[PDB]
Amino acid sequence: MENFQKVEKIGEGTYGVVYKARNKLTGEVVALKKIRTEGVPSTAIREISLLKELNHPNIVKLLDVIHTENKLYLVFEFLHQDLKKFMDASALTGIPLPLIKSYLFQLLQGLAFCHSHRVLHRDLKPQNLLINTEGAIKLADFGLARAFVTLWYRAPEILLGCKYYSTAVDIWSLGCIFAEMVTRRALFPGDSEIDQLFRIFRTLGTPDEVVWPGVTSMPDYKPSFPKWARQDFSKVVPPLDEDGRSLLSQMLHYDPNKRISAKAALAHPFFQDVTKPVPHLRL
Numbered sequence: 001m002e003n004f005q006k007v008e009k010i011g012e013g014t015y016g017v018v019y020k021a022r023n024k025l026t027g028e029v030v031a032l033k034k035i036r037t038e039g040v041p042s043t044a045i046r047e048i049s050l051l052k053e054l055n056h057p058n059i060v061k062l063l064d065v066i067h068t069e070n071k072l073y074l075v076f077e078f079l080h081q082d083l084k085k086f087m088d089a090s091a092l093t094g095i096p097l098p099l100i101k102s103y104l105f106q107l108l109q110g111l112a113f114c115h116s117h118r119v120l121h122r123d124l125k126p127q128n129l130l131i132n133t134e135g136a137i138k139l140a141d142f143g144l145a146r147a148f149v150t151l152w153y154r155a156p157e158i159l160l161g162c163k164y165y166s167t168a169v170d171i172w173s174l175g176c177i178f179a180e181m182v183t184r185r186a187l188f189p190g191d192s193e194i195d196q197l198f199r200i201f202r203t204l205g206t207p208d209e210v211v212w213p214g215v216t217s218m219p220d221y222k223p224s225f226p227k228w229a230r231q232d233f234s235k236v237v238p239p240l241d242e243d244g245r246s247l248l249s250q251m252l253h254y255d256p257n258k259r260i261s262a263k264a265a266l267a268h269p270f271f272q273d274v275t276k277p278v279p280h281l282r283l
């Protein structure tokens with residue numbers, strides 16, 4: 001678009017590339033996202049116009065939606081750094097737990113907000129979680145999935161062929177990120193759909209009708225699925241204290257219906273002593 005001067009590519013999103021750009025008129029720096037050709041379906045337009053409404057302190061604000069020359073651009077407020085870069089930058093000493101807890105609390109609030117509006121993210125990952133110098137973290141790419149690649153944070157029901165998943169898939173994704181921040185290593189680093197699923201099974205044990213009633217008749221479930229035993233969280237996420245492990249385990253429940261909500265999670269004892277530390281980031 002003419003009213004923007006790309007400064008650089010800051011990422012390769014799902015539905016198009018993201019650029020840091022400066023508005024030629026206002027002068028403000030922003031994050032410009034180019035979408036994707038039939039001319040941009042109507043349904044897409046409206047889904048996008050709704051996302052322009054749900055504003056929350058923990059959600060990257062969608063400033064303007066530009067549909068020019070049958071092209072689609074989303075203009076989002078610009079954030080200082082993504083969670084991924086900050087995580088890598090903290091691989092030596094690790095993110096202070098008080099900061100980890102603050103980031104989780106905020107993210108859960110964002111999801112809580114989105115879920116109450118029946119809007120799901122569906123593709124949460126360290127790359128689309130954004131942070132700023134003020135101690136804040138926000139969700140980006142929200143609602144775009146519906147409107148319109150790592151498998152590490154994908155919920156088991158999505159891997160098993162379930163077509164009408166719920167908001168609980170986001171809760172699962174967040175739990176995987178929560179653990180990653182704590183251990184400084186990906187929880188389930190799969191490299192193909194079956195490897196992802198089996199990595200989950202190996203750590204949490206293969207699901208059955210007991211822990212997940214109905215799992216055995218899901219579209220892609222195979223009874224030939226190996227039978228792995230469930231590992232203890234003390235081995236999976238040290239040095240996470242008990243309240244943390246207790247919370248993580250509920251975020252990682254197989255049955256999407258037993259999986260903790262963002263709402264309930266915010267009331268978990270893990271957040272009783274939550275503060276809002278400021279990060280030491282290099283821009």
Ligand SMILES: O=C(Nc1c[nH]nc1-c1nc2ccccc2[nH]1)c1ccccc1
Nearest residue numbers: 010011013031077078079080081082140
């Ligand atoms: O939308 C994405 N990112 C952003 C929106 N506003 N500001 C940003 C942003 N991303 C950055 C990455 C590195 C350093 C600074 C950044 N500011 C987005 C969506 C999907 C994948 C990647 C980025």
